[PDB]
Ligand binder design. Structure first.
Ligand SMILES: Cc1ccc(-c2ccc(C(=O)O)c(NS(=O)(=O)c3ccc(Oc4ccccc4)cc3)c2)c2ccccc12
Length: 150
């Protein structure tokens, strides 16, 4: 729940700002500096993943044919099915970036009400299936470190 609330805040913020185009700047709950830095790496890396995977993401999004809230709920079984199954690494992030891509689509089709639930679906899939890996990787500090550039 420590890692969950922190992941939910980062993923939820990232998804909301990708959708609306407006950066939400208000609190720094659950390891404040780590979350600010996680959110920063996520918007640099996440935007790169969407840029470099526009064709795949557009293809997949069209295939998914998300029209309403119930279509967003149906996404979770595919999400769990694909996201687990094999090897886990920071690159596999693509999960969040694809989520941000879907969140953008959701704003476009007047389904902004599904962005927060989608963020919760992604966090549930991420934290509940990979907690042990995440804690061993020092959580979001690990994500920040792995993607640290300069
Ligand atoms: C809302 C939402 C966020 C993130 C994922 C997700 C999960 C795992 C991976 C992964 O690779 O572990 C991933 N990365 S992906 O390459 O974008 C991708 C790879 C395979 C997919 O399956 C299809 C299923 C159906 C249609 C086309 C493709 C889709 C995307 C992204 C979602 C995956 C599925 C649905 C919603 C999702």
């Amino acid at each position: 729940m420590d890692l969950y609330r922190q992941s939910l805040e980062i993923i939820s913020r990232y998804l909301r700002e990708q959708a609306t185009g407006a950066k939400d700047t208000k609190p720094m709950g659950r390891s404040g500096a780590t979350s600010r830095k996680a959110l920063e790496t996520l918007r640099r890396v996440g935007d790169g993943v969407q840029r470099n995977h526009e064709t795949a993401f557009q293809g997949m999004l069209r295939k998914l044919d998300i029209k309403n809230e119930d279509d967003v709920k149906s996404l979770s079984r595919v999400m769990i099915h694909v996201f687990s199954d094999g090897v886990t690494n920071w690159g596999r992030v693509t999960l969040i970036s694809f989520g941000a891509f879907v969140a953008k689509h959701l704003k476009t089709i007047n389904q902004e009400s599904c962005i927060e639930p989608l963020a919760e679906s992604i966090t549930d899939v991420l934290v509940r299936t990979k907690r042990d890996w995440l804690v061993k990787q020092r959580g979001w500090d690990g994500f920040v470190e792995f993607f640290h550039v300069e």
